[PDB]
Amino acid sequence: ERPTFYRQELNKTIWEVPERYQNLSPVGSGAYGSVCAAFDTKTGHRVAVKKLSRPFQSIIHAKRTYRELRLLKHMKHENVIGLLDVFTPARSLEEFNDVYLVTHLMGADLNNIVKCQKLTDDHVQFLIYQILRGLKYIHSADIIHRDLKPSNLAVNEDCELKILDFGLARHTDDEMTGYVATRWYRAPEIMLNWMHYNQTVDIWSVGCIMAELLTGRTLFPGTDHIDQLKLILRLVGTPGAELLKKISSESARNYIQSLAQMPKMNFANVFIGANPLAVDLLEKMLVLDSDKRITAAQALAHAYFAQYHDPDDEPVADPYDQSFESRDLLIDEWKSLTYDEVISFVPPPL
Ligand SMILES: NC(=O)[C@H](CCC1CCCCC1)NC(=O)c1ccc(CNC(=O)c2cnn(-c3ccccc3)c2N)cc1
Known part of the structure; x- marks a missing residue:
């Protein structure tokens, strides 16, 4: 059931995203990160797609990636940003090197x-x-x-x-x-x-x-x-x-x-x-x-x-386990924990 991806260059960086997400256009020019607005063909609404920067370059980057994903997956409330989707073009842990987060696009x-x-x-x-x-x-x-x-x-x-x-x-x-x-x-x-x-x-x-x-x-x-x-x-x-x-x-x-x-x-x-x-x-x-x-x-x-x-x-909220913050793990462990959280993601109701 893995979607088909397409690749394009945007603000001088590669974006590889599911066909679901159409008409990508950079926004914020830095104030947001590497973020594009897009049209979500499954819903007919606009969304924001954030591509994380060098997510597993180091232990610190890997733990940052894991932290952000954990926090976004937790948040399920009208007045807090939520996660609409998370994806990677990688087909396996071995080739997992990029992470994209999808949210609502605010005005x-x-x-x-x-x-x-x-x-x-x-x-x-x-x-x-x-x-x-x-x-x-x-x-x-x-x-x-x-x-x-x-x-x-x-x-x-x-x-x-x-x-x-x-x-x-x-x-x-x-x-x-x-x-x-x-x-x-x-x-x-x-x-x-x-x-x-x-x-x-x-x-x-x-x-x-x-x-x-x-x-x-x-x-x-x-x-x-x-x-x-x-x-x-x-x-x-x-x-x-x-x-x-x-x-x-x-x-x-x-x-x-x-x-x-x-x-x-x-x-x-x-x-x-x-x-x-x-x-x-x-x-x-x-x-x-x-x-x-x-x-x-x-x-x-x-x-x-x-x-x-x-x-x-x-x-x-449901209780949020932040015991990871006290842990000292290897880079591949943080990466694998992240991968597992991508795989386990369940989208919100349509
Ligand atoms: N820094 C972090 O780790 C946090 C962790 C969650 C945090 C939530 C608040 C409680 C504490 C925990 N990440 C984010 O908050 C986050 C925000 C946005 C996006 C992608 N969308 C956008 O960038 C987006 C959506 N509309 N406009 C927008 C458009 C026009 C005008 C204003 C905003 C964007 N730029 C991904 C992650």
């Missing part, structure tokens, strides 16, 4: 919806509701996104939103000090290297995004790392007594004392003219102490989302 990211202009309060309710719905699901699998931002949120014409990650999926706290494209949406504990991050690092990002949808402007547009933190602390204040008691290190404490003491601002005096329920939710999302920050499930029940909330249609 625009959230920057392209906002365009430096305020959204209506009802539109903000709907967008944030959907982000939180997706995040309840992600977090229920014990997955943290860690890089939520407008470019990682895509919508269609009907304003249906999906959470994606156009970067490298991070899986541990230890990666937060590596590469990052923008830090405007990053929680202060990450910026301060406090470690022990919880899932509400993602809620911080949502708060930043929500503010920006409401005002049309970035909430914390720092020029650099230090400036990012200074802007954050001007809004949310210097740490309180309760939070200082949780800092293990004299220097971080001695550091945290070395920045100028800011009192927290009343957000009602910052988001002038906003819906008071929006301001209250923002207060609950942008708490400096992450132990006190609202969770996705809690936020879905906030009165701000009354017109959309349905406690019986905010589902959770």
